[PDB]
Enzyme design. Structure first.
Site, short mmCIF file in Angstrom:
data_model
loop_
_atom_site.label_atom_id
_atom_site.label_comp_id
_atom_site.label_asym_id
_atom_site.label_seq_id
_atom_site.Cartn_x
_atom_site.Cartn_y
_atom_site.Cartn_z
N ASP A 150 3.02 48.19 63.14
CA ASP A 150 3.25 48.73 61.80
C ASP A 150 4.66 49.33 61.77
OD1 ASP A 150 3.29 50.16 59.41
OD2 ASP A 150 1.15 50.58 59.51
N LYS A 202 15.26 44.32 48.57
CA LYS A 202 15.84 43.05 49.10
C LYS A 202 17.38 43.10 49.18
CE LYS A 202 12.25 40.47 50.15
NZ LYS A 202 11.82 40.30 51.58
N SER A 214 0.76 32.42 54.42
CA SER A 214 1.96 33.20 54.77
C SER A 214 3.16 32.31 55.06
CB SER A 214 1.68 34.11 55.97
OG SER A 214 0.85 35.22 55.64
N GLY A 265 4.63 39.26 60.37
CA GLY A 265 4.23 38.94 58.99
C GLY A 265 3.20 37.84 58.80
N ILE A 278 8.35 40.39 56.47
CA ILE A 278 7.57 41.55 56.11
C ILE A 278 8.18 42.17 54.88
CG2 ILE A 278 7.18 43.99 56.73
CD1 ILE A 278 7.44 43.02 59.66
N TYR A 333 10.04 42.27 39.41
CA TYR A 333 10.37 42.41 40.82
C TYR A 333 10.90 43.79 41.15
CZ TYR A 333 11.16 40.50 45.50
OH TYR A 333 11.20 40.28 46.83
N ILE A 340 6.45 31.41 46.23
CA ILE A 340 5.35 30.67 46.89
C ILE A 340 4.08 31.52 46.73
CG2 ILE A 340 4.48 29.57 49.00
CD1 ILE A 340 7.46 29.63 50.02
N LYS A 341 2.98 30.88 46.38
CA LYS A 341 1.72 31.57 46.16
C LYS A 341 1.11 31.98 47.50
CE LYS A 341 -2.92 30.99 44.26
NZ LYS A 341 -3.96 29.98 43.86
N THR A 342 1.48 33.16 47.97
CA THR A 342 0.96 33.75 49.20
C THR A 342 0.22 35.03 48.81
OG1 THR A 342 2.84 35.25 49.73
CG2 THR A 342 3.05 32.93 50.40
N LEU A 343 -0.29 35.78 49.78
CA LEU A 343 -0.94 37.06 49.50
C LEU A 343 0.01 38.08 48.86
CD1 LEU A 343 -3.21 37.61 52.69
CD2 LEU A 343 -4.04 37.16 50.33
N1 LIG Z 1 5.89 34.59 48.33
C1 LIG Z 1 7.03 34.53 47.62
O1 LIG Z 1 7.06 34.28 46.39
C2 LIG Z 1 8.32 34.81 48.42
C3 LIG Z 1 9.61 34.54 47.92
C4 LIG Z 1 10.77 35.06 48.58
C5 LIG Z 1 10.67 35.84 49.72
N2 LIG Z 1 9.40 36.16 50.27
C6 LIG Z 1 9.29 37.02 51.49
O2 LIG Z 1 8.60 36.51 52.68
C7 LIG Z 1 8.11 37.55 53.53
C8 LIG Z 1 6.70 37.15 53.88
O3 LIG Z 1 5.84 37.33 52.76
P1 LIG Z 1 4.73 36.27 52.25
O4 LIG Z 1 5.16 35.91 50.96
O5 LIG Z 1 4.37 35.18 53.25
O6 LIG Z 1 3.49 37.25 51.98
P2 LIG Z 1 2.44 37.89 53.00
O7 LIG Z 1 1.66 38.84 52.19
O8 LIG Z 1 1.83 36.82 53.79
O9 LIG Z 1 3.41 38.59 54.10
C9 LIG Z 1 3.97 39.92 53.96
C10 LIG Z 1 3.74 40.46 55.37
O10 LIG Z 1 4.38 41.77 55.49
C11 LIG Z 1 3.47 42.55 56.25
N3 LIG Z 1 3.54 44.00 56.11
C12 LIG Z 1 3.34 44.85 55.06
N4 LIG Z 1 3.50 46.13 55.45
C13 LIG Z 1 3.80 46.01 56.78
C14 LIG Z 1 4.08 47.01 57.75
N5 LIG Z 1 4.07 48.28 57.43
N6 LIG Z 1 4.35 46.64 59.06
C15 LIG Z 1 4.37 45.33 59.46
N7 LIG Z 1 4.11 44.35 58.56
C16 LIG Z 1 3.82 44.69 57.21
C17 LIG Z 1 2.09 42.14 55.79
O11 LIG Z 1 1.04 42.51 56.69
C18 LIG Z 1 2.24 40.62 55.73
O12 LIG Z 1 1.82 39.93 56.91
C19 LIG Z 1 8.51 38.79 52.72
O13 LIG Z 1 9.86 39.19 53.16
C20 LIG Z 1 8.59 38.30 51.29
O14 LIG Z 1 9.34 39.15 50.40
C21 LIG Z 1 8.20 35.63 49.60
C1 LIG Z 2 8.28 36.78 43.54
C2 LIG Z 2 8.91 36.90 42.31
C3 LIG Z 2 8.58 37.97 41.51
C4 LIG Z 2 7.64 38.90 41.91
C5 LIG Z 2 6.99 38.77 43.12
C6 LIG Z 2 7.31 37.70 43.95
C7 LIG Z 2 6.62 37.51 45.27
N1 LIG Z 2 7.26 38.31 46.31
C8 LIG Z 2 8.43 38.05 46.96
N2 LIG Z 2 8.78 38.97 47.81
C9 LIG Z 2 7.77 39.92 47.73
C10 LIG Z 2 7.62 41.15 48.38
C11 LIG Z 2 6.54 41.99 48.05
C12 LIG Z 2 5.62 41.59 47.06
C13 LIG Z 2 5.76 40.35 46.45
C14 LIG Z 2 6.82 39.53 46.79
C15 LIG Z 2 4.48 42.49 46.64
C16 LIG Z 2 4.44 43.82 47.34
C17 LIG Z 2 4.91 43.71 48.78
C18 LIG Z 2 6.36 43.28 48.80
O1 LIG Z 2 7.54 39.91 40.98
C19 LIG Z 2 8.43 39.54 39.92
O2 LIG Z 2 9.08 38.31 40.27
#
Ligand SMILES: NC(=O)c1ccc[n+]([C@@H]2O[C@H](COP(=O)([O-])OP(=O)(O)OC[C@H]3O[C@@H](n4cnc5c(N)ncnc54)[C@H](O)[C@@H]3O)[C@@H](O)[C@H]2O)c1
Ligand SMILES: c1cc2c(cc1Cn1cnc3cc4c(cc31)CCCC4)OCO2
Ligand SMILES: NC(=O)c1ccc[n+]([C@@H]2O[C@H](COP(=O)([O-])OP(=O)(O)OC[C@H]3O[C@@H](n4cnc5c(N)ncnc54)[C@H](O)[C@@H]3O)[C@@H](O)[C@H]2O)c1
Ligand SMILES: c1cc2c(cc1Cn1cnc3cc4c(cc31)CCCC4)OCO2
Ligand code: NA
Lengths: 259, 259
Positions: B62, B162, B18, B12, B90, B155, B191-194
């Protein structure tokens, strides 16, 4: 060490089996400066036990007493300018509250005492420790048990008190978070400590736990201690109001293969 | 470092925002040896990003593909004899599954894909990595979100996925614990990620979290990273099947003062 320099008060150290003993070892290993409390009679016992940890203070504190709790922070404030953490590792219910049928055995006074010492005491330490802990990523950690979440045989009044403890942890987390203080609990699996000494077939709860848990073992004071230590570090600054089960995974399973 | 010598696979990693970036920093700081995966197109991007962590391998994976997952462990087995941890970080759901009314937007296929990539993939890694992880106090950690526990706006399908992920973590914990493997999840605050890039008004979820949480702040990737790191150490050997909220305490409050 990830606790280097941090000033941490540990309550509840009673023997080398105490969960607090494990907490102490882990915190000492990680470079914390430690203080300890004891209940009246056990002064000499405790002083010997915690000598190996280079304590800055070893002070009386019977959490039945508002005055002693107040005086604890007055005396501690004479050796330390601020305080980084409080570890609450204290429980008590009268013996009669703890075996047989809950409804047969529960009494008004037993219920009161168990809550007083096992739950209220946490907020009391919080109340009196608060000004020393202001604005330094401070920590509190309480020890709890899954009997808070589920009805179990024997645990009875202690289960109810633990439930009141965990809620106290949450409301304390809410009340203190604006001072940067994080407040959490560690839910330990059963361990053969002096708390076990009243309980018959305690060894049985223990064997059951090792049989049904995902990890097929019993936790020890170091597993608990290490987790408490973590919860008092700058690494855990995003965690508050949480209960972390350190129980070999007992909390996540139902029933199992061996009925 | 408390991860010295441990061989850890991190999935991921996609930008320096990230959560996996934060996990990587924390584990590298703690002396872990790291390997990384990427999805097809992003080979060069990822190689550049994880270069600073002196990776033992940077391999395609993948998680849509059983073959790629199988090949990942074949290739990884050529550089390492055993494996200490897998970090699952991921998630994916099609864009249309993620805004507006859950019932209006949910589709059979979008639901399927979200679970496939966000939940099933965890067990798949577990399945293929199991023999390298046998009997060395190994670890798995998944990233999850509170949308699993509560209905939240937007969400939607990800929330459901999840929820499926967290159950997967528990059944994986049960299935792998006899090999000494601990399996846990970290529930991060937003968290403000991609992952946030599709979501209009993400900044407001973020402001809301900072207003309502006990700690009055937003977590960052290091707070999450440090926790994941801990959960892969010998210090956490008593913890499995657990969800640890790293969310500034969001999870333990209801309503707050500012309505
Ligand atoms: N950002 C938030 O607000 C937040 C909050 C709670 C949980 N999370 C979780 O953290 C994890 C990491 O996400 P992030 O927020 O750093 O965003 P991110 O976009 O950096 O990471 C998501 C990752 O999943 C990977 N991915 C998507 N399809 C894939 C596939 N088919 N095979 C392998 N990898 C694949 C993407 O390439 C990417 O590297 C996720 O489980 C996400 O739900 C994020
Ligand atoms: C946090 C809170 C949210 C949200 C999005 C988030 C941020 N976030 C956390 N896990 C994620 C998993 C995914 C995405 C965004 C994710 C976008 C598509 C890929 C799966 O949408 C409504 O409330
Ligand atoms: N042993 C287990 O199976 C287990 C499991 C889960 C949680 N816990 C919890 O861990 C904590 C530590 O217990 P332990 O198992 O190490 O046993 P222990 O008997 O060593 O520790 C309990 C401590 O509470 C102290 N105490 C009792 N009344 C007090 C009072 N009025 N003021 C100050 N201190 C008082 C006792 O002196 C003792 O030091 C307790 O909260 C207990 O519920 C224990
Ligand atoms: C563990 C599991 C049990 C139990 C006893 C235990 C062990 N234990 C955990 N917290 C405790 C708190 C107290 C005691 C024992 C405690 C003894 C009296 C003081 C309060 O009885 C039924 O199931
Ligand atoms: Na008094």
């Amino acid at each position: 060490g990830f606790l280097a320099g941090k000033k941490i008060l540990i309550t509840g150290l009673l023997s080398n089996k105490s969960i607090a003993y494990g907490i102490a070892k882990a915190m000492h290993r990680e470079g914390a400066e430690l203080a300890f409390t004891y209940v009246g009679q056990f002064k000499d016992r405790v002083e010997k036990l915690c000598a190996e940890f280079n304590p800055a203070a070893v002070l009386p504190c019977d959490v039945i007493s508002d005055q002693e709790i107040k005086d604890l922070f007055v005396e501690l404030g004479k050796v330390w300018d601020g305080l980084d953490a409080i570890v609450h590792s204290i429980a008590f219910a009268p013996r009669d509250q703890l075996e047989g049928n809950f409804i047969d055995c529960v009494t008004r006074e037993g219920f009161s005492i168990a809550h007083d010492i096992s739950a209220y005491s946490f907020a009391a330490l919080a109340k009196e420790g608060r000004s020393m802990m202001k604005n330094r990523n401070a920590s509190m950690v309480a020890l709890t048990y899954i009997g808070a979440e589920k009805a179990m045989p024997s645990y009875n009044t202690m289960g109810v008190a633990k439930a009141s403890l965990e809620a106290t942890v949450r409301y304390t987390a809410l009340a203190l978070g604006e001072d940067g203080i994080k407040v959490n609990a560690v839910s330990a699996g059963p361990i053969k400590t002096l708390a076990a000494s009243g309980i018959s077939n305690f060894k049985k709860m223990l064997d059951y736990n090792a049989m049904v848990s995902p990890l097929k073992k019993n936790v020890d004071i170091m597993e608990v201690g290490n987790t408490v230590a973590f919860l008092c570090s700058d690494m855990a600054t995003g965690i508050t109001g949480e209960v972390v089960h350190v129980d070999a995974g007992y909390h996540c399973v139902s029933m199992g293969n061996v009925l």
